[PDB]
Amino acid sequence: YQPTPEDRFTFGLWTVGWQGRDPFGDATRRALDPVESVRRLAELGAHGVTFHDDDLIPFGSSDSEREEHVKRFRQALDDTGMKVPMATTNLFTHPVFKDGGFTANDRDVRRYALRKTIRNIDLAVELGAETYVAWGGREGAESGGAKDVRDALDRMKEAFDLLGEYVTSQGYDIRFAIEPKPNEPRGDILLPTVGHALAFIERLERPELYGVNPEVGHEQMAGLNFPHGIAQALWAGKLFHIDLNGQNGIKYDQDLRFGAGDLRAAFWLVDLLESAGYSGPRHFDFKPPRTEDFDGVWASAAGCMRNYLILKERAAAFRADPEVQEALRASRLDELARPTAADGLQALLDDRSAFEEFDVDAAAARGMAFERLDQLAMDHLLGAR
C-alpha cells in the first residue's frame, strides 16, 4: 500500500512539524525547517503541502526575510515537485487573536485579520493554491455574554464577502472552504459543524465561491456521524476540501493519524469519498504524539496514507461484492434511490394503494436485513472476505 502523488495526499507543515507542546507539557522535538519537511514528505509519497502564513514566514518578518523564506520554500517545491493545493491563515496563535480574527470584538483586530488574510491569499495564488481554508478556531466564546452570535455571524459574513470581492476583483481563480470545529481552543466555536457552515454559506453574497473543509475529528468531537455529514456536503455540492485524522470519541481534539480512532467510520468515509468521485486533496491534519521522536513522526505520517489506501481497498471490495449487491437489494437500497412520487401530487392523492388499501401490517412485517448487510461490511473491513 504505497502512496503516489496521484493519490493527492497532502500534509500541513504544522502536522509533521508539531513540536509536541500540549496544555501540560513542553516541546519534545526541535522545530522542523519547512524545506526539510517538504523534502521528507515528498520521499513518503505525499502529493503536496499546505501552510499557514505563519508556518512559512515567521511572524513579523521583514519584507526581505519574507521573500527569502518564500524563495527557499519555492526552491524546495521546485526540487521535489510538491504542490501547494491549499493555504490558510493563522488567525489563532498570536495573542492578538485571543478573541478571534474575523469575529473579534475589537474592530481593529478584525481589519488586521482581513489584511493578514489578504496578504496570504496573494501569496497562496502565487504558489498556485486553488483552495483557501478558513478555520475560525478563535471565533467563539467560553461564556454566553462575551459574543452576540448574530452580530458575529454578520461580521463573519462581512469578512467572507469582502474576501470574495477581493478575489473576483483581482480575477483570482481560488475558492474558499470553511473548516468547522465545535470547540477547543474556545469553549464553543462558531459554525460548530458541517451543517452550520453549509447553512452559513447560503447567506453569502457569492455563495458559489465558498464550500466546506470538514475534519474527521471535529465532527466526532460532537458525537456526529462524519460520513453522514460528508454526504450532506456532497449533496449540496460543497465539499471543496477535506481534513483526515482520527479521534477517540468526545474529548479534546486528538489529531491522531487517520485510521486511528473510529475505524469503522473511517471505512464508511472512504467508501463515500471514493463512490462519490471526490477529486480534491486528501489532506491529513494530525499530530504525531509527543511520545515520538522524529522517526516516530514520519512513521505516523506514513500510517496516515497507508490506512487510507487499505480502507480504500476494503470499501471497493465491499461495493463490488455480488453478495453485497444482493444484500443491498434485499434491504431495498435500490428503492431508496427511486422517486417516491414521480407520478406527482394528484396521482399520489388518488392512489388508493398508497393509503386506503395499503396493507400496513404486511409492510411492517418485512425485515430490513440490515444486520446481515452490516456483518458483510464488517467481514470485508476485517479481511474475513
Next chain:
Amino acid sequence: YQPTPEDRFTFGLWTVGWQGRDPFGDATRRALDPVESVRRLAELGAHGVTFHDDDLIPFGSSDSEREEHVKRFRQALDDTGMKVPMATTNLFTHPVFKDGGFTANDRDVRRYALRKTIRNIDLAVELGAETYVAWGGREGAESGGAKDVRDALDRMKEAFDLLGEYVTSQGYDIRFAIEPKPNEPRGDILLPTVGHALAFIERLERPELYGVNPEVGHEQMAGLNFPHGIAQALWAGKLFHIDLNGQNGIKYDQDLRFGAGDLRAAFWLVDLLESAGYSGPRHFDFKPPRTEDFDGVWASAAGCMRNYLILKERAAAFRADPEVQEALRASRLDELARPTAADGLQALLDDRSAFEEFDVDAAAARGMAFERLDQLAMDHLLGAR
C-alpha cells in the same frame, strides 16, 4: 411566576400523557384522555396543545370514530379556549415506520408516510395550526450501509417539496418546521442538528415555506451550544417554532422539564429568545419521569412554565443592568456590532493603520474582561443581584 395564555406556552398531548414506558420498564401510569389533558393544561395556564395524528385519533380508526374523536377534542378546545398552533405526524411508533417514513427504503412506505401526513395537514389546518412540524425520528441508520445518505436527502427533499406543492395548491396558510435530533431511536438520525436542517431547507423548491423547530435536549445530545444554534436559526430567519426541555449532557434523550439539565444554557436561551423578539409558541416537549404519579405529572408541567418565567425575569434584569451595559462596552460588544469595513475593500487595502502601522502588541495586551461580565451574568441568574 404564574403563566398566562399570552406567554404562548404549549404542550404536546404526548408529554403529560406519557405513560412512563421506557426501554427497560412498563407503564407506571394509565393513559390520559386527550380531553382531560386539554382541560388540565388549560387550568395550568397553558396557551395551547399540539398533537401527533396518532395522539388524537387512535391508529386505524374508522372515519366515523375519527370524526367522533375530532368532535370530542374540538369540544374541549372550545370549552377551554385552548389553541392548536402546531401539529405533527407520528411517523415513528408503528412498526411500519421502523426504517423511517419519508426516507424509508421501501417506496410504498414512503408514499404511505406522505398520505398519512397529508391527511393530518388537512386536519391541522381545520384545527387552525399555523406550523406543521416534521421530526424524522426514524430517518437514519444504525449501520453505514443501510442508508445511502445522498439518496435519502433526495427522498427527503422530494417529500418536503410535495408537501409544499400540496399546501400551496390547497391555498393553505401553513408553514413547515423541521425538528433535528442527532440520534435515538436511530443510531444516527438524518439532519442531526439545527445547522444540518438549515442547510437542507436552502435546497427545497420553495425554501420560504420551511424553517426549523430546534429542541434543547437534542442539540445538547451532541454537546452543542443550544443558544448559539438558535442564534444562527434566527440570523437565517428560520426559527419557526421551538421545543423546550432539559438534558444532562450527552446521553439518552431525557426530556426533563425545562430548566432542569443545563441551567446556565436555559438562561442564555431565554435571553436570546426574548431579546430577538421571538414570537412563536414556547413549546414544551418533555416527559414527567416515570417515578411520578399524576400529581407529579402536573407538577412537572407547571415547573416547565415556571422555570421559563424565572429565567425570563433574570435575563431581562441582566440586560437592563447599567453595570452589565458598562461591562458589555468594556468587552467591546458594541464594536462587534459595527461593520468591519463599511469603507469598503479598497479603503481597507490602502489603510496602513489596518496592517503596516498596526500595533499588534498593544492590541494583544488588552484584556477582554469576559470573566467579570460572566460573573455578573451568574450573579443575576442566582439572584445575587
Next chain:
Amino acid sequence: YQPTPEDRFTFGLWTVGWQGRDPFGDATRRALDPVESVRRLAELGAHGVTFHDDDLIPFGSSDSEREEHVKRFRQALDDTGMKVPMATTNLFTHPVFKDGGFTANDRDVRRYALRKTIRNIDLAVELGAETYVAWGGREGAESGGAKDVRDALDRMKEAFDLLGEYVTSQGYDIRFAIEPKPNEPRGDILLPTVGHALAFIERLERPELYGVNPEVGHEQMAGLNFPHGIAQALWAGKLFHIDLNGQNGIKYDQDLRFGAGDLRAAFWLVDLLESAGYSGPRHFDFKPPRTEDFDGVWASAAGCMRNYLILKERAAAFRADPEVQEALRASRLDELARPTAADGLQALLDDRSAFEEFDVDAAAARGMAFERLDQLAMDHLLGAR
C-alpha cells in the same frame, strides 16, 4: 470462524428475545418461547443461556405454572446440552421497581426485592448457575435530592451482605457479580463504572464472594477505555463475568452486536481477555435492531460470536509476531514489567544515578516508538499482516 460450546459463548434469553419495543416504537417482533430460543441458540454454537427470573417465569405465576415453566425449560436444556452459567433478577421492569430494588426509598420494596432475588438464587443454584449477576438498573436518580447516595450505598451494602449470608448459610457455591452502568434508564445510576463497583465490593462483609460483570457499551457510555477498566478488574482478581456488545460512543445504550461500535477497542479487549487467561463465560448482552425480522435476529446473534473469534485470531497473531515483540521491547514494555525499586527504599535514596547524576535530557530525547507499534496493531487487525 465457527463457534463451539468450548468457546463459552452465552446469550441472555432477553437478547434474541427482544421484541423491538424502544422509547418511541412498538414491538416489531412476536415474543419468543424460551424453549425455542434455547434450541435456536444451541444450533448457532452457543454454550449457554442466562435469564432473569421474569424472562423464564412470567411475573406473578402460580407455583404450579412456575414449576411447569421450569420443567419445560429444564427439558430444553436437557435436550440441547445448553448450560445456565449465570442468572439474574429482573428488578427493573415492573412499575414497583421504578425507584429501584435494593436502594428503593420504600423499605417494603427493598424487602420485596431481596425476597424476589433470593427465590431466584435458589432456582439459579438448582439450574447450576455459578455466577449471580446484579444490575441495579433502577438504582439511582434523575434529580439530586431524590437519593442520598451514602444511605443508598448503605442499603446496597446491606442487601449484598444479606445475600452473602444467605448463600453461605445455605452452603451454596455461587458468587455474585455487580454489573455497572453509568446511566439509562435512570439519569445517573449508582456504581456507574467498573471502578465504582470494585471500590464498593471492598466494603462488603465477605468481599471474596463478589466481583464485577462489566459491559462494553456501559463503560463506553462514559467515554472510558473498556480494555483499561477490564485490566483493573483483572488486577484486582474480580472479573467474575463479562458482557459483550457494541456501542457507538456516548449516547443511549445501543446494545449493538459485539464488534459493532468501537472496533479497535473490541480488539484490545479480546487481546486482554485471552492474554490474561479469563476463563468465564463470553456473554453477549445485545439487542438485534428492531429493523430486523427473526432471520435478522439470528444473523445478529451469529455475528456476535463471529466477531469475537475473528478478533481473537488477530490479537493472537499480533502477540506472536516477532516484529511486534521487537517493537514491544523498543517501547520498553519489558521495562514496564520490572520492579522500579526492588533494591528497596534506602538503596533508591542513596542511588545517585536515580537523581543527582541522572541525565534528564538524554532520557527525554528517547522516542517511545508507540506509533510504529500501533500501526503494527492496526495492520494485524485489518489483515494487512
Next chain:
Amino acid sequence: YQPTPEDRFTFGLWTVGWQGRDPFGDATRRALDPVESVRRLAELGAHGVTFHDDDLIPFGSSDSEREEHVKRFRQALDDTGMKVPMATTNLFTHPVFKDGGFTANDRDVRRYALRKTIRNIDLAVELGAETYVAWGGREGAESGGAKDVRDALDRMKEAFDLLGEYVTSQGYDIRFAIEPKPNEPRGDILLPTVGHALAFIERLERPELYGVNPEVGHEQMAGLNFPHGIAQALWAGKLFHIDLNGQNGIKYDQDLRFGAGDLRAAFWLVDLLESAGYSGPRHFDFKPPRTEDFDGVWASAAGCMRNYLILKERAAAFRADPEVQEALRASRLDELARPTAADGLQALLDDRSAFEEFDVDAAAARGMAFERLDQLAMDHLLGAR
C-alpha cells in the same frame, strides 16, 4: 459573600499564574512571581496556596537557588499568614515524563520520578503540608499496545507503597491523595475516575495512608455525576482533598472557575460537602481564560470563592426549609436511611408480608414525588425561595 481564611479556600500557584498558553496559542500574560501570587491571593481572602515543586523552584535549580526560592516563598507565607495545606509533584511538564512518571515504561525515569517526588515530600513537610497530591497526568496511553495496564498498576502500587514506606520511616504525618482524570493530556489516563482510584487504594500495603482528590471537571469529562462520586468517596472515608472548578460537558478540560459549567451539579456538590462535614481545604484548580489580563485573573479567582459561598447559602436554605423536609419525607428519604432487614435474614425469609402477601400493585401505584422535590431545589438555587 466575602471569603475568610476559615472558609479554607486554597489556590494552586499554577492557577492564577497560568500564562494562557493553550494547544493553539502563545501566552497572553507574563509570568507571575509566586511571592506576588501569595500576596494577591491573601488579599482576596484565600486560606492557602498549593504548589508543584516546579512552580516554586525552577526546574534544575542549584541547591543555593533552591533555598533562595524557598526562603523568599517562606517570607511571603510568613508575611501573609497563608498556609500550604497540600503540595504535589510536577511529573508531567518536562519532556522526560512524556510517557509518565510512576508508570513510565523506562525504569530509570520511574526511579527519577520517585526521587523527584521524595525530595518535594521533604519540602512539603517542611512547609507544613498535610496532604500530598499525586496527579498521574502522563500515566496512560494514546494507543492500546503502549501500556500493559496490569503492569502499570503494579508499578503504580509499587511507587505508592514506597512513598508510604518513606513517610512512615521518616515519621512524617502526611497523607497521600490520588487525583483521577479520565483523559488529557493522554488519550486515556490510568485510574480514570474516583471509583477507579478508590478501588486501587484498597490494594496498597498501608491503605489508611491514601485517599482521593477528585476534581469537578475531571469526572464530568466522563459524563459522570460528580456529587454521586464524592458521596462514594465519603462513604469509603477517603475524601482527603477536593479540587473545585467548572466544566461544560464532555470536552477538553476547561478549568473554568467554580460555578461555571454545570451549575446544578455545583449546588448538589456543595450541599453534600457541607452536610457531610467535609473539613479539608476547598481547593480551586482552574485557569483564568486567556482572553483575560491580570485584572481578569483576580476577578476569576474571586468568582471561584464567591460562587461556592452563594451555593453554600442556597444549599443550607434548601435543607432547612420545612417544606423541603416534608417533601423529603414524601419521597421516603427517611425510609431510605432505615435498615432494610435489621430483623435479619431468617426473619426476612419467614416474613410473608415481604413477598407472599406483598401487594405489588399498591406499592407500584405510589408516586415518588421527586419532581416536586426537585422544583423546590430549583426554586432555592434560583432564589425564588
